Amino acid sequence: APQQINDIVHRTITPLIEQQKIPGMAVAVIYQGKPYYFTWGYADIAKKQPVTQQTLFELGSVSKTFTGVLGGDAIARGEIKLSDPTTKYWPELTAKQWNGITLLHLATYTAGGLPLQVPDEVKSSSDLLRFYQNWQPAWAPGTQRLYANSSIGLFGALAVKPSGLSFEQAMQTRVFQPLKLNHTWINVPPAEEKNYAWGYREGKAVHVSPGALDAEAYGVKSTIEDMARWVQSNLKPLDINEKTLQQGIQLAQSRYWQTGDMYQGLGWEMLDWPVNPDSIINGSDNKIALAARPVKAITPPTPAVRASWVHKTGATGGFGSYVAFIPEKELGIVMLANKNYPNPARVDAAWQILNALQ
Ligand SMILES: O=C(O)C[C@@H](Cc1cccc2ccccc12)N1C(=O)c2ccc(C(=O)O)cc2C1=O
Helix, strand or coil: CCHHHHHHHHHHHHHHHHHHCCCEEEEEEEECCEEEEEEEEEEECCCCEECCCCCEEECHHHHHHHHHHHHHHHHHCCCCCCCCEHHHHCCCCCCHHHCCCEHHHHHCCCCCCCCCCCCCCCCCHHHHHHHHHHCCCCCCCCCEECCCHHHHHHHHHHHCCCCCCCHHHHHHHHHHCCCCCCCCECCCCHHHHHHECCEEECCEEECCCCCCCHHHHHCCEECHHHHHHHHHHHHCHHHCCCHHHHHHHHHHCCEEEEECCEEECCCCEEEECCCCHHHHHHHHCHHHHCCCEECEEEEEEECCCCCEEEEEEEEECCEEEEEEEEHHHCEEEEEEECECCCHHHHHHHHHHHHHHHC
């Protein structure tokens, strides 16, 4: 690889791993459209299995970027509209608080205070109906953003209804397969089990547990190679031959709401480039990122801006991931780790790397 890339990546990542006691890590840098890969440490400590370019990591909430684009693809196919009432796709949802709550609000966490997590107790379809029926908003729709798996999770489930496909089948057929993400999974198959890293939390080996609307909100597993290709695809959607997928990617980076200096897309979050690093670094802290904040409506939404820092953080109990890119600069990064280490450390390292290559 170019020495510049080698040196910035290693000088930033080595101390990060040391400081954060990360068992295993994979990093991709996309530089002028081409990926460069780096790996450290262990996918499985006990069995002495190293992290490779084929190792699967739990993306956690980075999954929301796939959900957003899949929703975008459905919009482009004419199957749904973000302006549609939630009730259009869920006729059993009769409770009056849902009047005025649209697919846009679900997708962008602005329904009025849907909770971060679907309760563990919610198992069945009848349980889920009861949960959403009984949910009482703190705020009018389209006034406050509160990051929520229960929000974008429901969006994901409803966006695929008109197709008649399950969420997983829809994602496989319409996103993963066209983009040749052949080692990206909602459910890891037996054939790939040898490559599936353990997550580590408080020293114990852990994998994500099943939960309602998990696929839609936090359930994707992927390799560093497929994630680099995912970044390439979002960096440069005009290279994508499938027209509805191309438009869907573009819609996911449209700017729907603004809070502080961030803009909410479908899954993706964006800021103008050049960014104030302090703002993205400090803003990634879950203190801020999980806080209820007032939003300004962008009416109508701004199309995907090339001069953006586009990103998403995501975690599970045992994994920590970050993806960021700058379309204008054909520059991007993917950082996958099998420890949930603090968001700001992720973003700081990503900033340092991309800033040096920009
Ligand atoms: O960083 C993210 O991607 C979002 C966070 C949001 C979240 C969900 C549940 C409990 C949490 C506790 C502290 C902080 C965030 C939490 N998140 C999740 O969204 C999430 C889903 C599943 C698991 C699991 O290991 O079963 C863990 C998490 C998880 O930490």
